[PDB]
Task: structure prediction
Amino acid sequence: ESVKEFLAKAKEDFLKKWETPSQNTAQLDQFDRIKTLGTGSFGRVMLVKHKESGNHYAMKILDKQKVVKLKQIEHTLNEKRILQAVNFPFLVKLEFSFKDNSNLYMVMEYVAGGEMFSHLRRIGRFSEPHARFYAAQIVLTFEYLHSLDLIYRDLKPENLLIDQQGYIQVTDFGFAKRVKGRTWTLCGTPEYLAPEIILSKGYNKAVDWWALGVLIYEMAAGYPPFFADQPIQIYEKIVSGKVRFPSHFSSDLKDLLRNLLQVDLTKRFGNLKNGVNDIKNHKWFATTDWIAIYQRKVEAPFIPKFKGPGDTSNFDDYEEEEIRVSINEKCGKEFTEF
Amino acid sequence: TTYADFIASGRTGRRASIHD
Ligand SMILES: Nc1ncnc2c1ncn2[C@@H]1O[C@H](COP(=O)(O)OP(=O)(O)O)[C@@H](O)[C@H]1O
Ligand SMILES: [K+]
Ligand SMILES: [K+]
Result:
């Protein structure tokens, strides 16, 4: 309806940026680095303050040598190329990007509410209305991303930030990829991998819908549907694919989850003839006003405490390390396009 | 309970991505 024209225009905007990416829009000495907000397997994100504007941002710093060592060059180029090109209410904005002799930098809006992860572990679990509010935003976000032929591949509470209005901001496009049809990389987070990833047969955007299943379950249960102490045991459970539900889950929720956590691709919601509408029109989401969610007019069920720009109280503390920059350029050719 | 078994497990903290 107005979704089609919306998405069509969205694609035009995205493609222009995808075709001619922004580069080199800031420099290191334009910011004062304050505190580490979070880390991933080979990245660190710091709260910084931009000198000339006074604004705070979140600076993701990647050591080029580590990226190379881990064979993540192409992924890293994907991450930045895609992030600089997208535009959606629940995707974090990339404000600047640049590189120096040693590191790559992606400077994003600072989302001060913290990871969904920390709130979820602390509180224990989210009620179904609360989980539903967040899930709706992810459904819309994947509808947008997929329409651009993008697959996100890293949905998890750790990569979802809560903004000052209580809405979600998706972060970490490390595994995002523009692909028409099928791909094969074993990547993601173990608990969230679709079986077809694990079984190495090639996969498509449907893996995102599976992961949404895992996210909804975890939000509403307080623990993932497939957990164990080591990744290998997790994969065994996923591939078995037997799911059990908490006693408090509604019938509607369970029915939705059986259709998302569905090994059979001919049967998995999101992957059928009716596409995302099989999800939007499911009884679990009957109370959801899809347009109002997009417009951010729904009252958030939780609104984290804010305490003044630069407040980091919604984030765990991390050990700090010096940001080295060598007088010798590292991996210059590899990252030419960054 | 499932909750107890989760909470006693080694994977209750922030989870790292994998990328092989
Ligand atoms: N825009 C941001 N605002 C506030 N915190 C951020 C932002 N982006 C990332 N973070 C914090 O940094 C952590 C790591 O960011 P992430 O992009 O997931 O790096 P990685 O690829 O190394 O896992 C996130 O889990 C979150 O705690
Ligand atoms: K991450
Ligand atoms: K990442």
The domain at 21-114+306-336 of chain A is CATH 3.30.200.20 (Phosphorylase Kinase; domain 1). The pocket of potassium ion (ligand 3) is lined by residues A 40, 172, 174; B 17 (CB under 6 Å).
